[PDB]
């Protein structure tokens, strides 16, 4: 956690940023509505999801997109989990 927080942007510089799960573009905000221009132009309705990354990461990915490389991100949708009681274990020796 220490290094994770050291390498991150200051918590006071947070803001809401959305990403299109289809092409990886940072969704723009037009009239208060989140919209991916590229996918809207193609008559698609992709999911927009919130991310929390550093600014330099966005700069790097955009510059990589300039050279022609498309970078796409998926997100984890693990099914829900439930806690179950567990029997006791001793672990001491027989002395």
């Amino acid at each position: 956690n220490t290094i994770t927080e050291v390498l991150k942007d200051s918590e006071e510089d947070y803001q809401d940023v959305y990403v299109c799960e289809n092409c990886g573009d940072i969704a723009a905000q037009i009239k208060g509505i989140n919209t991916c221009l590229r996918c809207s132009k193609l008559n698609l309705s992709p999911l927009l999801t919130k991310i929390d990354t550093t600014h330099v990461s966005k700069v790097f990915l955009t510059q990589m997109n300039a050279r022609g490389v498309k970078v796409k991100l998926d997100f984890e949708r693990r099914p829900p989990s439930f806690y179950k009681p567990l029997d006791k274990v001793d672990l001491k020796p027989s002395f």
Binding site: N1, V89, K92
Partner: protein, 103 residues
């Protein structure tokens, strides 16, 4: 013979080290600092005049710690680990905290 090894490994899962207890304390302390509700017994207006670390240790000891940890494909509360190891690590941690003026 696979069942025997599976049982031995399940028992092995219950041992506790510094990393796990430190992580549990970190999660509980962060959530409490940012404003959740303490789950101690006899909660009252006097509970807010104590030290938050005393509150966390009390919650752990009386079995009302909400943090659940996943170790080897299972989900364990802080009370499912071996009790003696929990006492061992907590004693060490409380000593060093007292040296730091936290406890």
């Amino acid at each position: 013979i696979g069942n025997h090894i599976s049982a031995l490994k399940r028992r092995y899962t219950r041992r506790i080290s510094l990393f796990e207890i430190a992580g549990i304390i970190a999660e509980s302390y962060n959530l409490l600092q940012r404003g959740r509700l303490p789950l101690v017994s006899e909660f009252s207006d006097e509970t807010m005049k104590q030290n938050m670390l005393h509150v966390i240790i009390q919650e752990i000891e009386e079995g009302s710690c909400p943090i659940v940890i996943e170790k080897n494909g299972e989900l364990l509360s802080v009370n499912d680990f071996d009790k003696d190891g929990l006492k061992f690590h907590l004693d060490y941690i409380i000593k060093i905290w007292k040296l730091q003026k936290r406890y």
